[PDB]
PDB file of C-alpha atoms in Angstrom:
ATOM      1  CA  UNK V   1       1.451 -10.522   1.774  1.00  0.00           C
ATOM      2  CA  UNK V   2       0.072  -7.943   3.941  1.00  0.00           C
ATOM      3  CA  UNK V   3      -0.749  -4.173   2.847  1.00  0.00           C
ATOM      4  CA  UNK V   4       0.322  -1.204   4.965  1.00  0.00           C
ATOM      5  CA  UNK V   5      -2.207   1.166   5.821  1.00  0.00           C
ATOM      6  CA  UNK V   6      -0.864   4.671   5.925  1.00  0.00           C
ATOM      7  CA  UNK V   7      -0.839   8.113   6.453  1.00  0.00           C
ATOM      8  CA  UNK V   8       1.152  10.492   3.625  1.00  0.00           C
ATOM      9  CA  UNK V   9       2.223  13.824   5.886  1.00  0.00           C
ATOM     10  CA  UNK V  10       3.862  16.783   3.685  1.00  0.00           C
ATOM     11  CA  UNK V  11       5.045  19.406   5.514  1.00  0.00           C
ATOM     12  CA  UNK V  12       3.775  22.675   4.489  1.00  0.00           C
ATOM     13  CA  UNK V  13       1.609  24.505   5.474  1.00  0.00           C
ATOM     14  CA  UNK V  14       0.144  23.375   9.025  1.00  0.00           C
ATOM     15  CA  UNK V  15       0.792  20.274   8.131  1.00  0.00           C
ATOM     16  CA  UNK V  16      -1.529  18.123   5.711  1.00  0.00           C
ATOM     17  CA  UNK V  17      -1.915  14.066   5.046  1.00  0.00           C
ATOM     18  CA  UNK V  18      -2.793  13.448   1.864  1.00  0.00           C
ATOM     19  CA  UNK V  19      -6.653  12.277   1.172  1.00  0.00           C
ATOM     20  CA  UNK V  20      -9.254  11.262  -1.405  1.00  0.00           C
ATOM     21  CA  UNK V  21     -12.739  12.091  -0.649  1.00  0.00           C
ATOM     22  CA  UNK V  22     -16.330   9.984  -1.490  1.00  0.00           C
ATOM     23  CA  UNK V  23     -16.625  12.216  -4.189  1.00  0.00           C
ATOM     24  CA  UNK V  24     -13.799  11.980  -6.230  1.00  0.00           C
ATOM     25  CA  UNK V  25     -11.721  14.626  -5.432  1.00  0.00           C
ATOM     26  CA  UNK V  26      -7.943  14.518  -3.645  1.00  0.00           C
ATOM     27  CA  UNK V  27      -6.661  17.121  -0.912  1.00  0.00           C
ATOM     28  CA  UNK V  28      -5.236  17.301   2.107  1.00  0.00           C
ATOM     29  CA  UNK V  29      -6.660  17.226   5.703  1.00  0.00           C
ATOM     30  CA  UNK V  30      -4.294  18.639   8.826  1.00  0.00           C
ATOM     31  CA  UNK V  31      -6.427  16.328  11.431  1.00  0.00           C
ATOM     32  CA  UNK V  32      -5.697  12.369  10.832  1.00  0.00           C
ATOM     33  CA  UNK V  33      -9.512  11.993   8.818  1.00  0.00           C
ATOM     34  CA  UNK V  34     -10.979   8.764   7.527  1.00  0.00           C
ATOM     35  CA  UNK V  35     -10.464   9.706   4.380  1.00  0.00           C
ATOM     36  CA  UNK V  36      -6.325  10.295   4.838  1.00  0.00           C
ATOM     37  CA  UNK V  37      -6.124   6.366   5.488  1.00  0.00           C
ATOM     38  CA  UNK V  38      -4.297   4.841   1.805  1.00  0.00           C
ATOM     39  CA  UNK V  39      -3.420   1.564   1.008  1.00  0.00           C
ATOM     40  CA  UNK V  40       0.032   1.497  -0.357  1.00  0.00           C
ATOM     41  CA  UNK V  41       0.194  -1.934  -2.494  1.00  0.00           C
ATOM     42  CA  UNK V  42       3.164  -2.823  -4.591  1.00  0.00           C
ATOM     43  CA  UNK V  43       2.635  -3.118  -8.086  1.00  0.00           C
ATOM     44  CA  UNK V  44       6.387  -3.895  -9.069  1.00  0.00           C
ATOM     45  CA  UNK V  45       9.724  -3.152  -7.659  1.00  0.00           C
ATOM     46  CA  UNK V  46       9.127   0.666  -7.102  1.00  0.00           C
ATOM     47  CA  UNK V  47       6.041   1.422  -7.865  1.00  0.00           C
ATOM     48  CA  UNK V  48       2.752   1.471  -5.750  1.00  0.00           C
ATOM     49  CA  UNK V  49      -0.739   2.142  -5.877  1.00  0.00           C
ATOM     50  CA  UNK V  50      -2.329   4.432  -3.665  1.00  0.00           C
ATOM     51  CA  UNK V  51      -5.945   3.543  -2.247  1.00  0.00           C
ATOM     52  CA  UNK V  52      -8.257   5.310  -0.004  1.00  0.00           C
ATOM     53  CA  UNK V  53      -9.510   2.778   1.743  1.00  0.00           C
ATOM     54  CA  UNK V  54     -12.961   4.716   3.198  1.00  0.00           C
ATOM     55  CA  UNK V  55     -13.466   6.910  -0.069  1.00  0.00           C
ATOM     56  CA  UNK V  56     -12.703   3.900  -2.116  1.00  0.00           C
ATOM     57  CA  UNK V  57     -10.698   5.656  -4.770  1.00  0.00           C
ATOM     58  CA  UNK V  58      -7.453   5.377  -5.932  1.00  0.00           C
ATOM     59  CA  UNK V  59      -5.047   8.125  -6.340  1.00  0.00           C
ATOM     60  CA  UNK V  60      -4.694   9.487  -9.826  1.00  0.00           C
ATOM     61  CA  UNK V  61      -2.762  11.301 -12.058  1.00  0.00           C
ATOM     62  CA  UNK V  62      -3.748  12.662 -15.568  1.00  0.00           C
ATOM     63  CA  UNK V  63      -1.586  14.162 -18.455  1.00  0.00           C
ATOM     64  CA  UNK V  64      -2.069  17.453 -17.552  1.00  0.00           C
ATOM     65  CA  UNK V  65      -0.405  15.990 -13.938  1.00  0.00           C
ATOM     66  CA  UNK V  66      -4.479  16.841 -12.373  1.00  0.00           C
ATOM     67  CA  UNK V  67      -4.798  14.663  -9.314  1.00  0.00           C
ATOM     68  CA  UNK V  68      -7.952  12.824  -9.510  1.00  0.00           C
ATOM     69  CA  UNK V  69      -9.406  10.002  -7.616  1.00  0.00           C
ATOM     70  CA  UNK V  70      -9.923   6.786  -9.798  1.00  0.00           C
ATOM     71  CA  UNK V  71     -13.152   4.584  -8.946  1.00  0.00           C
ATOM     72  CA  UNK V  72     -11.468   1.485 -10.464  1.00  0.00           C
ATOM     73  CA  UNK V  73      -7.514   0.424 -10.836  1.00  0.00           C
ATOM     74  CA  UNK V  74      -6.269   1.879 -14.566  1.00  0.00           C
ATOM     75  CA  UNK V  75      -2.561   2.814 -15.528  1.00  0.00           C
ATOM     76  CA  UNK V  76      -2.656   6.647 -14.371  1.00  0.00           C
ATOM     77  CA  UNK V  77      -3.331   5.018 -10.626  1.00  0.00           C
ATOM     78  CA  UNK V  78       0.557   4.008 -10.208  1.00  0.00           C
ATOM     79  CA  UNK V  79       3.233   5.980  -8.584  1.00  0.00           C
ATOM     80  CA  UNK V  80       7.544   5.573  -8.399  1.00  0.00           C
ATOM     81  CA  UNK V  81       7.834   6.097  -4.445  1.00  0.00           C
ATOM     82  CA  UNK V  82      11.280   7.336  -4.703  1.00  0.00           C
ATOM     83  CA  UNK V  83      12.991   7.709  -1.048  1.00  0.00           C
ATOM     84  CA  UNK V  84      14.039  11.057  -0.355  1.00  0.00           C
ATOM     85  CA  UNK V  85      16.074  12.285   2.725  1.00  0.00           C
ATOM     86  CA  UNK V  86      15.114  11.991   6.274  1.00  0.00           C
ATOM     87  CA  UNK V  87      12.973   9.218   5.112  1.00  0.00           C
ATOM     88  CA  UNK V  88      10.367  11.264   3.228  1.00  0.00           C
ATOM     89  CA  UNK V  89       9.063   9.777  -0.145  1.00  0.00           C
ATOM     90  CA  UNK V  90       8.491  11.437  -3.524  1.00  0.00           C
ATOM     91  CA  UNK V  91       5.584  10.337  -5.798  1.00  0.00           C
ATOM     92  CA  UNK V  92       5.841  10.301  -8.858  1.00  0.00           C
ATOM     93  CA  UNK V  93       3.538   9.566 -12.374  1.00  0.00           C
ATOM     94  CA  UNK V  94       4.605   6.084 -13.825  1.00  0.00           C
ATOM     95  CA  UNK V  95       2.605   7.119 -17.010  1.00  0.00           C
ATOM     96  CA  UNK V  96       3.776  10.528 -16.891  1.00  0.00           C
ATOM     97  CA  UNK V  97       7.547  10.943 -15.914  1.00  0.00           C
ATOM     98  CA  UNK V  98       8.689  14.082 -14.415  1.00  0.00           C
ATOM     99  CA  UNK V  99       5.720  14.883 -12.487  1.00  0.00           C
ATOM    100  CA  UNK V 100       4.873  14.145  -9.016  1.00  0.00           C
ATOM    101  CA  UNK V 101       2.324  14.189  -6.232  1.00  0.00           C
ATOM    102  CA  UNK V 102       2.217  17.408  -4.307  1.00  0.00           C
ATOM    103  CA  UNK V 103      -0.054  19.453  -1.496  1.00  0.00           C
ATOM    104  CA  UNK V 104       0.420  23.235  -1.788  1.00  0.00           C
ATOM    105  CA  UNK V 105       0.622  25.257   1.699  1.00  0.00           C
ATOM    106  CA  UNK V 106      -3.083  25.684   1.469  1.00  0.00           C
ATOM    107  CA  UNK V 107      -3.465  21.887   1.696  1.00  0.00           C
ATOM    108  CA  UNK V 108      -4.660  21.780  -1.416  1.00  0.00           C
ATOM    109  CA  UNK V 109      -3.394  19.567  -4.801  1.00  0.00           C
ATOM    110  CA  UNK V 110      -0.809  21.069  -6.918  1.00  0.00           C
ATOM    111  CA  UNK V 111      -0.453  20.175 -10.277  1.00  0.00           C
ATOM    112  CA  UNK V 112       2.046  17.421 -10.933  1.00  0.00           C
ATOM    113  CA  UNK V 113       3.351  19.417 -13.809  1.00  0.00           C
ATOM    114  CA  UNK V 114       4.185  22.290 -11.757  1.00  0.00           C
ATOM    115  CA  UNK V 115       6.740  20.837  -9.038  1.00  0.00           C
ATOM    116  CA  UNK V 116       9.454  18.844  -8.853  1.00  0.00           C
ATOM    117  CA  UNK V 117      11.297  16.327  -6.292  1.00  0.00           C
ATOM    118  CA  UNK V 118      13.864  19.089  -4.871  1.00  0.00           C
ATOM    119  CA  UNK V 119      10.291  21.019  -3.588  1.00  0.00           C
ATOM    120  CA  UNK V 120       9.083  20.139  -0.028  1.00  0.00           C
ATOM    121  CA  UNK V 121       5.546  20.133  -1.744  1.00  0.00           C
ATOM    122  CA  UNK V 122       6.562  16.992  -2.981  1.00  0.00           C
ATOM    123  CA  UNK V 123       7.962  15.566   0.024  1.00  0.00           C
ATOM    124  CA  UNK V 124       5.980  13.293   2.051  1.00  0.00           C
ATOM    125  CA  UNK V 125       6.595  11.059   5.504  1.00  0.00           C
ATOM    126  CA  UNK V 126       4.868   7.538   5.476  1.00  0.00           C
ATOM    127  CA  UNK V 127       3.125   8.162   9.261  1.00  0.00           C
ATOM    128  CA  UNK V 128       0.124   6.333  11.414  1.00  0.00           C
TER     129      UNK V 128
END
């Protein structure tokens, strides 16, 4: 079926979408960029994939819970999307339980290792 093409807000900071850049590396970006445009695709019940559709890399997360953009699908590029309230989602490492996907105030990556789901780092609202 179809794919939804999203925008993953977290609310810290000013305000920063989630995005993987042309060059591998994952941020954030206040201002609704290319780059901030993912693919969410369903891999099984609960658990998605996360693709930047102008970058062309997926979202990925390493043992060390580093966030790193993937070139090519591979079992560190799938994520729980666990609801949350107010209809934000958390992320988290199918791989790698207990850590989750998370943009520091600065709009930059956190380390998955390093915050958990009760954090509003982790938080993020599907948007655009």
């Amino acid at each position: 079926g179809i794919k939804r093409l999203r925008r993953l807000y977290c609310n810290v900071g000013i305000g920063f979408h989630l995005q993987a850049l042309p060059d591998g590396r994952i941020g954030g970006a206040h201002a609704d960029t290319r780059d901030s445009l993912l693919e969410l695709s369903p891999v099984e019940r609960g658990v998605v994939s996360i693709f930047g559709v102008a970058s062309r890399f997926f979202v990925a997360m390493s043992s060390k819970g580093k966030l790193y953009g993937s070139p090519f699908f591979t079992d560190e590029c799938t994520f729980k999307e666990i609801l949350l309230p107010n209809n934000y989602n958390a992320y988290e490492s199918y791989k790698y339980p207990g850590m989750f996907i998370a943009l520091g105030k600065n709009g930059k990556t956190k380390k998955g290792n390093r915050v958990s789901p009760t954090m509003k780092v982790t938080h993020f609202l599907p948007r655009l």
